[PDB]
Structure formats: C-alpha cells, structure tokens
Scaffold this active site. Structure first.
Site, PDB file in Angstrom:
ATOM      1  N   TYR A  21       0.830  -1.219   0.000  1.00 56.15           N
ATOM      2  CA  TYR A  21       0.000   0.000   0.000  1.00 56.15           C
ATOM      3  C   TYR A  21       0.856   1.256   0.000  1.00 56.15           C
ATOM      4  CZ  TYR A  21      -3.253  -3.490   1.853  1.00 56.15           C
ATOM      5  OH  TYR A  21      -4.065  -4.625   2.087  1.00 56.15           O
ATOM      6  N   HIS A  52      -2.584  -1.889 -10.838  1.00 61.57           N
ATOM      7  CA  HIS A  52      -3.493  -0.743 -10.785  1.00 61.57           C
ATOM      8  C   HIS A  52      -2.922   0.286  -9.747  1.00 61.57           C
ATOM      9  CE1 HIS A  52      -4.711  -1.870  -6.631  1.00 61.57           C
ATOM     10  NE2 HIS A  52      -4.758  -3.125  -7.008  1.00 61.57           N
ATOM     11  N   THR A  58     -10.556  -3.285  -0.195  1.00 61.23           N
ATOM     12  CA  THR A  58     -11.602  -4.165  -0.818  1.00 61.23           C
ATOM     13  C   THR A  58     -12.912  -4.009   0.047  1.00 61.23           C
ATOM     14  OG1 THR A  58     -10.915  -5.940   0.580  1.00 61.23           O
ATOM     15  CG2 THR A  58      -9.774  -5.718  -1.536  1.00 61.23           C
ATOM     16  N   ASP A 180      -3.982 -12.838 -13.366  1.00 61.82           N
ATOM     17  CA  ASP A 180      -4.565 -12.952 -12.035  1.00 61.82           C
ATOM     18  C   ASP A 180      -4.679 -14.430 -11.759  1.00 61.82           C
ATOM     19  OD1 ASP A 180      -5.942 -12.091  -9.764  1.00 61.82           O
ATOM     20  OD2 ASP A 180      -7.878 -12.617 -10.636  1.00 61.82           O
ATOM     21  N   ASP A 331      -1.048  -6.930  -7.476  1.00 64.75           N
ATOM     22  CA  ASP A 331       0.182  -7.143  -6.768  1.00 64.75           C
ATOM     23  C   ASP A 331       0.560  -8.627  -6.682  1.00 64.75           C
ATOM     24  OD1 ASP A 331      -1.922  -7.714  -4.768  1.00 64.75           O
ATOM     25  OD2 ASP A 331      -1.043  -6.308  -3.345  1.00 64.75           O
TER      26      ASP A 331
END
Ligand SMILES: *[C@@H]1O[C@H](CO)[C@@H](O)[C@H](O)[C@H]1NC(C)=O
Ligand SMILES: *[C@@H]1O[C@H](CO)[C@@H](O)[C@H](O)[C@H]1NC(C)=O
Ligand SMILES: *[C@@H]1O[C@H](CO)[C@@H](O)[C@H](O)[C@H]1NC(C)=O
Ligand SMILES: *[C@@H]1O[C@H](CO)[C@@H](O)[C@H](O)[C@H]1NC(C)=O
Length: 435
Positions: A21, A52, A58, A180, A331
């Site tokens: 983060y 992104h 989330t 992903d 990530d």
C-alpha cells in the site's frame, strides 16, 4: 508529492514503509546501476507489467475498517495524545475502486512510459491487456490517457491513434488468466501466507496494542485491529486528498520503527503467499513468463499452466510483433511473475523473526516491488557492443539483474541465454501439483 519521474516523495520515512500500500516511489540508482539506456543501445521491444493505482480497501476490508473505527468511537471514554482525532473522524472510504490519486498515478505512469521510450513510442501503438477487475481496467485507461497526453504533445510522433485495451481477461476460478491467479486449486487453498502474517503480527503488535489501549480508555483491540489501524494510514492518505498531499492522522500513531515492522509484515505476506516462500507461489507466474518468452522471441506461446490457448493462438488477442506491450495486473500475480522469472533468485528465504532490509533481501520488499501503481519494464535492446539482443528488467526503475544466464555488470543477458535459463517455467514448473 507525486511526480511522473520520481513517484511519491512526501513523508518518505513513512510512506515508503506501507508495503503494497505504498504509492510507487522510483528506486532509480537504489542498490542498482542507472536505468538509463546504455550508450550505443537502441530499445527494440518493451513489455510493461503494471499494477493498478492507489485504491480504496476491498469491500471486505472496508467493512472491517469502518466497524473498527465505529467500535472505537462507541467504546472510548477518552482520545488521548495523537489519538484525539479519532473522536471526530468520519470514515468515508469506498470499496475496491481507484482513488483520484491512484487514477493520476496511472496517468503519470503512461507519461513516464512514453517519455522513457519516446524513440519507439513515437511510431508504436502498444498492445494492451488488463485483468478483468474494474480498478485494473480503469488503471489501463488512465495509463493510456497519460501516454496519449505525452504523445500528442510530441510533434515528432507519427502514429498517433490511441491504443485501446484489446483484451480484458476474466477473473474466475475457471478462466485461465495469466494476469490474475485463480485456477491452481491447491494453491488457492494455501493458508501459508496468512499464517506467516498472523504469526509475525503476534510478535510485534502486542506493544502497540497496549499503547493504543492506554490512549483510548474503554477500548479493547486485537493484534488484528492494530494492523487495521496501520492499514488505514495508507488508505486514508491516498483517499483524503486528490494528490495525497496530506498524510493521514492514522500514520503518526505509530513510530518509524513500527512502520519498518509493518513494511516487513507486508513483504512476508507476499513472499510466503505468492513468492518463493509458497511452494506453489512462482508457479502462478509461469503463464505470464511463457507469454513474455513468446513475445521476446516472436514465437508461438508454449504453455500449459494459466495461459488460455484460445486467446494466445489468435493474433487479435495475442500478436507476436507489437513491439510494445502493456499488461495491467494485481500485486500478488506480479509477485509470482517476478519470482517465476527468477528475478529474486538472490533473495534468501525471509526471516520470520527479524526484519531484513530490502538490501539484505537483494532488493526484495513489497513496497520496492508491488507498490500501488507498480511497474516493471522488460526491455530488449540492440547495442553496438553485441550482435544478439540484450534483455534488461527494471522494477520500479531499479535495474534487477537477471538470473539463470550470463549477466553483465549492467544487469543484462543475451536474449536466448535469458530464455534458456527460464527452463523451470518453460517446462511448466510444478504446476501439476495444483491438482
Ligand atoms: C479460454 O478463453 C475462451 C475465449 O474467451 C473461453 O471461451 C474459454 O472458456 C476459456 N477457457 C479457459 C479455461 O480459460
Ligand atoms: C504460527 O505459530 C507458531 C509460532 O511459534 C508456529 O510454530 C506455527 O508453525 C506458525 N505457523 C507458521 C506458518 O509459521
Ligand atoms: C486452462 O488451463 C489448464 C492447465 O491449467 C489446461 O488443462 C487447459 O487446457 C487450459 N484451457 C485453455 C482453454 O487454455
Ligand atoms: C530460480 O531458483 C529456482 C529455485 O531454485 C529455480 O527453480 C529456478 O530455475 C531459478 N530461476 C532462474 C531463472 O535461474
């Protein structure tokens, strides 16, 4: 605070210690040679792999956070010292979406890409894919916006059509998506990363919990709540202004020593979750590695892991000669990809009881490697120094010397030597263990 070239440089004693983060900060010349195009070299292909941008938590974590802030406000009989703000703090964070700061990081990333590769980008419309997550798609769009911002401002650009996102790869437990993870059943059931993270948090959180409880009489916190309050420093900072120009009040609750523990906690979760610490972690990056090898060698993909054979065999969805490729991801897949590519094969297994700096870890850390807005550039170049194309990897502007091949002092290998060294991925690794 955030600039095109350097990334985020406000409050770096704190904002560079938020693991995945942290806003991207450039690691140019950090434990590394310069990332500049070496003398008498010309880039001939570049693949970009980008995360992104900065986002809200989330929906799951956003709920958790808000519950915790509400319980603190309900329970506390006072708010002492640096905790005073919590009395009136209004939890306004969303869920999942980019923040406006995060959008702008991706426009900056697109500008930096065009400027760094201007010689090529003047005539090339990159071939772009995104994983099917709305923040990832939106990041792709903002990166295109930046790339075109720069391109249309350059009177020397000749091929000015905007790129589109050509492929949006669904995210599903049943759709093979190299950007992903999701299909490798055994790996999806692994709890190792979470258990390492919980065990480490148990070492360091108790002192902080005692101290927070002392400043918030009436409140009871778990070690998990400690980590939630630390997470809120980055999330609130990236949301509370459009330019992340104001450090969150959550941040000063914790000391710089405690931030370096949090930073390591995040490096631990990614290493044992998705990196070489997890017995199936690097296997999640095989599919992309075999896609990159197909692109670097201009050859059909050979893979039986997470590529989709329909998508890779149609040039509309997988051209082999686009010269510039940009793919948007997350990530954790980016962690597994970098480890599948062998880029962290100088990093020894992370101590689960001492904090090791990215320097003892050979440049590995979550904030050095998968910050918000992270990007990797994989270049081929033709240099007067050599007949064969030379490959170089840059991760957040740090040159990350290649492993498995005869690497030079600028971190480069000849292309076919690099690809031969990727024998584990080329052979499918231990992907069979997924089932
Ligand atoms: C492969 O992609 C095709 C084309 O969209 C889709 O029909 C198929 O379900 C995908 N299969 C897997 C396993 O990803
Ligand atoms: C979590 O707790 C203890 C700490 O001593 C340990 O023995 C156990 O194996 C831990 N789990 C992991 C993955 O470390
Ligand atoms: C999806 O991946 C599995 C290997 O994981 C493979 O068995 C299957 O053929 C792939 N399907 C497609 C369409 O690529
Ligand atoms: C990195 O190390 C792993 C674990 O030893 C090995 O499987 C892999 O082949 C190495 N990768 C490269 C590119 O040297």
């Amino acid at each position: 605070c955030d600039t095109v070239d350097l990334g985020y440089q406000c409050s770096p004693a704190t904002s560079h210690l938020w693991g995945q983060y942290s806003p991207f900060f450039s690691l140019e010349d950090e434990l590394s040679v310069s990332s500049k195009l070496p003398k008498d070299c010309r880039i001939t292909l570049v693949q970009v792999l980008s995360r992104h941008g900065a986002r809200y938590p989330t929906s799951s974590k956003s709920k958790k956070y808000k519950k915790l802030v509400t319980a603190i406000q309900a329970n506390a009989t006072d708010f002492k010292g640096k905790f005073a703000f919590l009395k009136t703090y209004n939890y306004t964070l969303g869920a999942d979406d980019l923040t406006p700061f995060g959008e702008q990081q991706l426009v900056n990333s697109g500008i930096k890409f065009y400027q760094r590769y201007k010689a090529l980008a003047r005539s090339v419309v990159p071939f772009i894919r995104a994983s099917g997550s709305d923040r990832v798609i939106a990041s792709g769009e903002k990166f295109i916006e930046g790339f075109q911002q720069a391109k249309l401002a350059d009177p020397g650009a000749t091929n000015r059509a905007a790129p589109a996102i050509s492929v949006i790869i669904p995210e599903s437990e049943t759709f093979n998506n190299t950007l992903d993870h999701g299909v490798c059943t055994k790996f999806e059931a692994s709890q190792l990363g979470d258990e390492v993270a919980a065990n480490f948090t148990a070492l360091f959180a108790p002192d902080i919990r005692a101290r927070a409880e002392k400043h918030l009489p009436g409140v009871t916190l778990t070690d998990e709540d400690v980590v939630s309050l630390m997470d809120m420093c980055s999330f609130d900072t990236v949301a509370r202004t459009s330019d992340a120009s104001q450090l969150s009040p959550f941040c000063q609750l914790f000391t710089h020593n405690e931030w370096k523990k949090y930073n390591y906690l995040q490096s631990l979760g990614k290493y044992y979750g998705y990196g070489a610490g997890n017995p199936l972690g690097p296997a999640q990056g095989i599919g992309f590695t075999n896609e990159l090898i197909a692109r670097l060698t201009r050859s059909p993909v050979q893979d039986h892991t997470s590529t989709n054979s329909t998508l890779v065999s149609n040039p509309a969805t997988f051209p082999l000669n686009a010269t510039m490729y940009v793919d948007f991801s997350h990530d954790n897949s980016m962690v597994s990809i970098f480890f599948a590519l062998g880029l962290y094969n100088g990093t020894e297994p992370l101590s689960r009881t001492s904090v090791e700096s990215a320097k003892e870890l050979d440049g590995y850390s979550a904030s050095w490697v998968v910050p918000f807005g992270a990007r990797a550039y994989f270049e081929t170049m033709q240099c007067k120094s050599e007949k064969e194309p030379l490959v170089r990897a840059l991760i957040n502007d740090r040159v990350v010397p290649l492993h498995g091949c005869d690497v030079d002092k600028l971190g480069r290998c000849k292309l076919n030597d690099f690809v031969k060294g990727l024998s584990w991925a080329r052979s499918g690794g231990n992907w069979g263990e997924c089932f």
